[PDB]
């Protein structure tokens, strides 16, 4: 698959914040969702907040405590998300490409994909 444009991604870093983002298929349209789930063997995986198509409801914590996520851009449509404090340990591959699922929703058990795929083999666990 062809890699999609991004403005920063990969393993998280301690302290501060990272505006994880990935280019979306649509252009100048913000009525789309997004998912940042990373698939990899083992228990070294943490749930990641999801954004619905409507965009009125933000993250699994609801808009009551969340912050608006930018999903519109001029040069290239992109989605911006804010990352909460999490453990630096990570072992799953990162591949910002075309998403395998487009029916974004508010579900929690739902994941980006079941199996793994092509991507960078960066790991800081083992």
């Amino acid at each position: 698959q062809v890699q999609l444009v991004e403005s920063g991604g990969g393993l998280v870093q301690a302290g501060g914040s990272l505006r994880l983002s990935c280019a979306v298929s649509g252009r100048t349209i913000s009525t789309f969702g997004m998912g940042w789930f990373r698939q990899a063997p083992g228990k070294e995986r943490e749930f990641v907040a999801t954004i619905t198509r409507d965009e009125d409801m933000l993250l699994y914590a609801d808009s009551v405590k969340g912050r608006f996520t930018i999903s519109r851009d001029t040069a290239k449509n992109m989605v911006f998300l804010q990352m909460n404090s999490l453990k630096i340990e990570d072992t799953a591959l990162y591949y910002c490409a075309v998403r395998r699922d487009s029916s974004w929703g508010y579900s929690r058990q739902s994941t980006e994909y079941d199996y793994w795929g092509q991507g960078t083999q960066v790991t800081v666990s083992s």
Binding site: T52, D54, M57, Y60, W104, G105, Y106, S107
Partner: peptide
């Protein structure tokens, strides 16, 4: 006021 992810919706939002 506490709308957690319990309302698991697929493809559409609860709103």
């Amino acid at each position: 006021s506490a709308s957690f992810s319990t309302f698991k919706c697929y493809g559409v939002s609860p709103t």
